[PDB]
Amino acid sequence: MFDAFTKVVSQADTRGEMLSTAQIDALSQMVAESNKRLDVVNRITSNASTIVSNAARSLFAEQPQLIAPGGNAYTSTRMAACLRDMEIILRYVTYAVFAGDASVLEDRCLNGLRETYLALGTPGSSVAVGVGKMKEAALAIVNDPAGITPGDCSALASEIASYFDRACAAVS
Amino acid sequence: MFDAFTKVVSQADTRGEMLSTAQIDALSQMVAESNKRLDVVNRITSNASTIVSNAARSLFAEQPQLIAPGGNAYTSTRMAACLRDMEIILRYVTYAVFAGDASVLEDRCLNGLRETYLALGTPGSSVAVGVGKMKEAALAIVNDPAGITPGDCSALASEIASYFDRACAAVS
Amino acid sequence: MFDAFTKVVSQADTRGEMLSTAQIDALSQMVAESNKRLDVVNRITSNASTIVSNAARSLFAEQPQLIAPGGNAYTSTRMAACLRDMEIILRYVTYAVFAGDASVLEDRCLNGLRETYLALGTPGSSVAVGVGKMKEAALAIVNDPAGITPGDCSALASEIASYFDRACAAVS
Amino acid sequence: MFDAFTKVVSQADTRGEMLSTAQIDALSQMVAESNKRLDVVNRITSNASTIVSNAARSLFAEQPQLIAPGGNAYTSTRMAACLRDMEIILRYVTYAVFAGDASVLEDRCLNGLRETYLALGTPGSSVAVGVGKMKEAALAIVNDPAGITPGDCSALASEIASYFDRACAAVS
Amino acid sequence: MFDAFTKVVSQADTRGEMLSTAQIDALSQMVAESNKRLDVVNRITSNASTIVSNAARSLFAEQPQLIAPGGNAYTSTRMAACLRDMEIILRYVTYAVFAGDASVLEDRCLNGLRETYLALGTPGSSVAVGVGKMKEAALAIVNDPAGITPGDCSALASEIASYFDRACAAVS
Amino acid sequence: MFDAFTKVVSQADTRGEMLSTAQIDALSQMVAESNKRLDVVNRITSNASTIVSNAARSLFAEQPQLIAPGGNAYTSTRMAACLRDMEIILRYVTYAVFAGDASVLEDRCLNGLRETYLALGTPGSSVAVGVGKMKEAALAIVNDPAGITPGDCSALASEIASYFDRACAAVS
Amino acid sequence: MKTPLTEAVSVADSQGRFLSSTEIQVAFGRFRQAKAGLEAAKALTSKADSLISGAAQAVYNKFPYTTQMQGPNYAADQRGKDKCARDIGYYLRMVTYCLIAGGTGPMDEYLIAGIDEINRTFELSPSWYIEALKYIKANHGLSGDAAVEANSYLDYAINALS
Amino acid sequence: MKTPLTEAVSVADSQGRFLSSTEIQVAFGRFRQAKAGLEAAKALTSKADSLISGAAQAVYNKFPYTTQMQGPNYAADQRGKDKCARDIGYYLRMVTYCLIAGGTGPMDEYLIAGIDEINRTFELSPSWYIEALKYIKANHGLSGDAAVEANSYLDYAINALS
Amino acid sequence: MKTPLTEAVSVADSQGRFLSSTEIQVAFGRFRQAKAGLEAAKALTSKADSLISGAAQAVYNKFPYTTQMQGPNYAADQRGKDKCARDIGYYLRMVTYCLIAGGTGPMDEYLIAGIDEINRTFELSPSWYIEALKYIKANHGLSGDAAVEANSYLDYAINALS
Amino acid sequence: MKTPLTEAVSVADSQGRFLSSTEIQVAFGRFRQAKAGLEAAKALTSKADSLISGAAQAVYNKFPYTTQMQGPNYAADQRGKDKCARDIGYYLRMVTYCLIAGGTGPMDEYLIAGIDEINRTFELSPSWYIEALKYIKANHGLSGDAAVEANSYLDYAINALS
Amino acid sequence: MKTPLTEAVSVADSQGRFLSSTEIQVAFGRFRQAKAGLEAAKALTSKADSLISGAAQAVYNKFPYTTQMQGPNYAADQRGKDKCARDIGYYLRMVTYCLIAGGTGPMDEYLIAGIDEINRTFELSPSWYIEALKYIKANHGLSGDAAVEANSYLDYAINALS
Amino acid sequence: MKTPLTEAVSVADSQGRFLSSTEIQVAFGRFRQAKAGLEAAKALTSKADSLISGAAQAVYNKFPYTTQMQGPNYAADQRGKDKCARDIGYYLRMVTYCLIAGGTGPMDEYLIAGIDEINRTFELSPSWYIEALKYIKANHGLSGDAAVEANSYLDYAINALS
Numbered sequence A, B, C, D, E, F: 001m002f003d004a005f006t007k008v009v010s011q012a013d014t015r016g017e018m019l020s021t022a023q024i025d026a027l028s029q030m031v032a033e034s035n036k037r038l039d040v041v042n043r044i045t046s047n048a049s050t051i052v053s054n055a056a057r058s059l060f061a062e063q064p065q066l067i068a069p070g071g072n073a074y075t076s077t078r079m080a081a082c083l084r085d086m087e088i089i090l091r092y093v094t095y096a097v098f099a100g101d102a103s104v105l106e107d108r109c110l111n112g113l114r115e116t117y118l119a120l121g122t123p124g125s126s127v128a129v130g131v132g133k134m135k136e137a138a139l140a141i142v143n144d145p146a147g148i149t150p151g152d153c154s155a156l157a158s159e160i161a162s163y164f165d166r167a168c169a170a171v172s
Numbered sequence G, H, I, J, K, L: 001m002k003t004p005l006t007e008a009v010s011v012a013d014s015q016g017r018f019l020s021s022t023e024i025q026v027a028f029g030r031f032r033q034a035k036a037g038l039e040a041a042k043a044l045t046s047k048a049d050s051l052i053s054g055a056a057q058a059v060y061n062k063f064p065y066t067t068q069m070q071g072p073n074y075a076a077d078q079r080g081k082d083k084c085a086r087d088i089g090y091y092l093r094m095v096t097y098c099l100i101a102g103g104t105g106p107m108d109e110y111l112i113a114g115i116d117e118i119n120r121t122f123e124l125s126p127s128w129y130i131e132a133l134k135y136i137k138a139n140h141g142l143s144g145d146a147a148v149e150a151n152s153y154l155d156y157a158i159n160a161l162s
Ligand SMILES: C=CC1=C(C)/C(=C/c2[nH]c(/C=C3N=C(/C=C4\NC(=O)C(C)=C4C=C)C(C)=C\3CCC(=O)O)c(CCC(=O)O)c2C)NC1=O
Pocket: A032, A033, A034, A035, A036, A037, A038, A039, A040, A042, A142, A143, A144, A145, A148, A149, A150, A151, A152, A153, H144, H145, H146, H148, H149, H152, K021, K024, K025
């Protein structure tokens, strides 16, 4: 995986060049905002359970065929794996938000997943909906103005949504 | 894997339904005739080596190209493997007869066996003939009015023939 | 794997025949010139490092893009892998010279290598160049009339070139 | 391993002798009472969690040093392990009751358990008390004239107590 | 393993007590001088190879029988092992300096080492002597007032000597 | 393991010396009479089954308590283990004869065997008897002057007797 | 799927062995037991609705707070009451399946595997279902080997929950 | 355990490596977070009894049946009330420990590992402890990184239960 | 030792599971079968000498060369005839043991394991023993499940030899 | 396949090593031996018919019943005698292959692998083939390292049957 | 790749864990360090030519033979003098990369992995690069935590060569 | 160790096989080789002192700086020259051992294992030793198969150094 730094480093390395002052300044700007970047990891992490369970509960409400007998999320063995997948996606998203790069989310979680759900008989299009709900909840939990210094996080909150959107696009 | 009971159970679970009284009565009728089933398991099993070796000798008698130098059954290693393939197929067939369902034979034996034989250069057709001879021998042994309480076991014999036919079909 | 002996044996066996006297004659003929074969084994082996390093340097000098940043041989970890691939191929070729049969080079080395380099995004034909460069070096090393009983080693050199060609053709 | 049958068989084989009629009659007498045996297997098994947890709570009630901070059963990991040790011992005891021989409990559970507890710092004596409580509870459950065909099962109860005593003895 | 914090935490946990305010002030005291700690970690780490090789070279000069033919450091394999041992011991000390606790050093590196040297017949006595020189050189390196903000680092040095001494004592 | 050469090499290496001409001369003596050495390996090897089975059969005839029911050689599994052990001992003996050094016979075979036979309850002093017969048969086979260029092999016979006696002593 | 026949086969297969008198004996035991088991499953199936409603009510009795508290994990609204009846229905149906199969297999595969995860995640108390099961056990009206076998599975479910 | 220093060491150890600038940076973060965390644990230790008491009472308030139901797993008698108080005390203590260590390690080792087995074996509902943790979170009167970190641990424990 | 009970236990143990109705069913089958099995073993035990001598004679009839040829592997002297009667006795005794156990376990452990090695090494023809067994099978006089079970083991020994 | 060269290469390969003086010495040994070996293999090929017929006859002489007993495993008819002649032919040919390969490789790959299973399956006595091998060994009329190396393989085959 | 963030994630991931305060502390450390590190790499980037030329010259000074020996491993002609400067350039570039990553990761992946292999294969003396690194360390004119960190990568590279 | 005999035994032992004509051929090769090898080892021994000195002077000639540069890794003084001649002596003695053993085994176990680590650690340049060996090839004066085998080890040592 890469992070915000090593990504640029590798990009520069395969050109055999040092980082320009512009790239460094960019990374510095990124550094100057990194408190808010860990507040979000903290906040999303601290609500992982309810995020997953609320998103899942809503998903099943809107799509009762998933939990109906014969449904892919019926039986407590598959429901657990379903909640598990949700939690995993969320986790890797938080990894992406933490690292400041999507590589960890792509390399490990998302790549090959559409095909996996295809093989299993899992509706990825439902997973994506789950991910969407998780996203909406996560961003709101993130944007909470209580118990934190006020400021702008419009940039970070867009990146996070970028990651969630990547996750969603990967299984649709 | 599936037996006569769990197959119906699995069919029922996917519909979110309990076994109908008819479905149960059928299984009861199967249970009523189970002694015969185990008698044939015993009879085929007890004759295993004889069934295999007789079928093999027959097969090589009608198909001498198999044991001629350059034949796929020539050399003792390939002859051994050949005999064992026969033995295995018979074994999984007895498993099918015992279980009351073809699932074991399907999943643990026949699945991917043709491609195997193709890759090896083994003529699956000959295998099938072998299985045919084994079917004949076994079924003749299952009937044998000697040393047993007399009764009708036609359906069971049919079922057995079914499993053998499955094998013979799968390999070619 | 086969050598010069078991290759003929394994050919005769499939026909159920003993070796013709002409085959035994050819083999005795090979035996008559075995000292030369082991001389080339010893000679190529003895210069294993230089044969590889010279070819590598010569390859990089002619194809500077391979070691330039972004090149597949750039960084030490990949350069190591490259040198190692060269060494490996040379080794298996010497195994082929020693055995007097190419099967060890076929099955253990060259089998699947193309697709491997393909997956890696490695230029197999550059490998083929390297091998092409190691071949000539080897033959030059083998044809040295210094410190050895003078004699003719043409067929042998031909056989060596055959194996190297085998290697080159399998990656290209 | 040994059951009530194979133990005698093994004893007989070493003497190169067939089972005497008395040895057989004994086993027949054991067979005559086998329904009770399985009834207790069922009864202890069905009450597993209750037996274990009740015994544990009792044990911790009389021996609060175990659950005090610094006690060997303090922290949930050690409490879990503790509970499971109880469960395991009970399980292998039920195996002994089922098998009609103590060999399973001996060989697969108790053997080398004291040294284990010693190395760990776990007080085997406390384990033994736990097993004692489990013995009491289980035996009370086995008796229970409710919901069963009445009869005498004193010998069986004794045997069970025997197995429990074995465990309690082995651990301390 | 334990660091300076979890050590106190665990010692407190076994009593079932919260940290006393004094115990916490004690830790804040350590926090207040952590820059120096990491300075020495960096400093010793930065001269690992010279610290090892100097000590070793000097060790061999004072005890030439170690490298004499038949000696325990004769041959390049045993010499490599020897240097490796020096480096290992040095490493696990820096671990202790970094962690602020000797638990990792004793647990992972030292405990069971004299027995190893026993079974190997290795002269632990000389090893300790090696550790002594490494200690001296490292402490010299740490106390260098060049290229660093000046202040008192005597407590830290005193702590380091303790680790080196535990290492030296463990194998003596 | 060592052979006749590397054994002398190791001794010379421990002192940091080159083989004195005397040692080399001795080795040259060993070289000179190595056709005999391999002749016995070939002869003994070519009669393995018969040596073992003869010794075993007569052994069971001298000491019938072994094969009597309850005896250590009773049952086919232990009879097979027994014949196997005899065969292993013979095999490693031939390895020693071939290698010109007993190290392989000592380390990989006879080491700890005395204790094993004790733990198992096998009478080692019968294994020794078993070996003492294989020896007698073996040198009888080796000393056979038919179908061989006549010469003296007293030294070698002595050496072989050495190894058989070695095996015999190592199990009692 | 843990059943006598499948288990017998699988043990025979894991040893690369033809079935012997051992597995035959297993089968005999199975088929002997099935005579009562199938009948039992039939009875329960016929008593399904009654047993479910009864068990649900018993749970509501034992834990009245489950009918008052707000939250998606409670039965204070019709939705939760439906979820409840559904779950208890699942349990009962699993018991019948177990009677049909002659083992805990169906319940294991369809229910037990992951039950902890589900109960923990959705905040459902295992004791509720224990209470439902204890009641079903009391009211199923079965007798003989039928009742014994059924109660084995009931108590198994209970053990899986504690 | 899971702490910056010990993890930093364990990683490097698993790689057979000397500590680099990375581990030094981990340490640098730790020692600066320590300034707040160490004092946080202090403030929490000072308010221990009050927080535990209030939390227990909060549990009893939200789940009244715990003070009324007979059973070894309830605080309907003195024994159970002391059990409850003890457990809540353990939780709070673990939180302080996590603040001391700068990581969840202590809680993981002493509490989280096997909590599911315990809660399930002794029929203890996670919601109770979730409620206690909620109450403690809402009453510790901390602020700044102290509050954030402590609350991260509280939410972690809450997460381990849900 | 392959027996129904031991197998049941071991499968239960390999899964870290308490015994369930499955193993109970195995046991029921076993104990039902034992009623005939033990009796059978008794009968054979009482018919031992006769059956042994008979089988030996049958082998001598089928293969007369075994009573003429010199060599330690033949029965042309009294020694070999004793070895023969002994071996056949072993086989019969194993069959009885199998009847007692309810499985091939005893025969497997005491006889089958290494039978090829022994026959090959000592140059004993498997067909001799097959002939002995075929005869024992004909002359044992058993009937019902007893005979069926016994013949299962006989044919098993026969299969082990071919 | 077990030959000197192939084993040398296998050794070298399993160590990621280039061939050194060791493998070279192995090869030198092989090629020195092959001078007699190939000659031997050539010689035995010319004696095939007579050696096989004589061997078969030797077997028939030692074991007359094989020419008298009915059954597919015996040689009382032409069908049976041809199989025997063929088999002995296979053995002899394998010996030649071994002489050519300089090892037991060919015979191991083509004959020894599965010999027990085949002989055990079709009720073929190893003693017959041992007798045949003894005859061939006694009647081949080779000399020098030829006869020795050939006899090593003959005796090897003999041991493979004992 | 050794860097604070990627590591922290990779640590948490192999444990199947969400990021806790530990990794956040690692991050705080990294970001606090980055403010100096980025400035450091930025500075070094501007001094590349000077430091590289100076280093190469220092090497040629320390080891004059490199400028007056025949062979492709030496810098007695133009190609070699360019190869050397290239290599030193690579080293410096890797240092700047390491300063930006906050760890030795880039230098590990791009340079150290396989350094011994290269140096041994192409006859490049480590001492040549130790001198080049020693020069750079004593001429980069950095100050503060920039120097301390940047010099931790130079000494790390030195250790990798010793 | 890598020698014909021990490896012949090793492969046979890993197969669990009695030796055959293969290992015998290996042995024959080894013994045929030893006749020249031992002689070579002798000749080299009686010329040791000369070869080492000449080799040392050759190294000094090719790399003059090794006799001018201070530091313990160089031979600018007495001790260093002693170390050098010692090392060269060791290298030669390994060659002798290899001739004695019939393989690179001794040199492998006593010298090759860790040579990279030592050379890197003690700043010893392989080029020096390669030169020293190159001289020895030229000056050893051996002839015949004795010379070819000796050179194979020298070139093996060189390869290990490059
Ligand atoms: C280990 C746990 C931990 C974390 C994670 C943490 C984060 C953190 N957030 C901070 C401020 C801050 N946090 C935010 C974030 C927000 N402002 C908003 O209105 C919103 C919605 C957001 C959410 C993204 C902002 C804007 C600042 C002020 C500017 C800044 O420091 O970046 C600060 C610096 C100020 C301070 O000392 O509190 C830190 C250290 N502190 C800790 O102890």
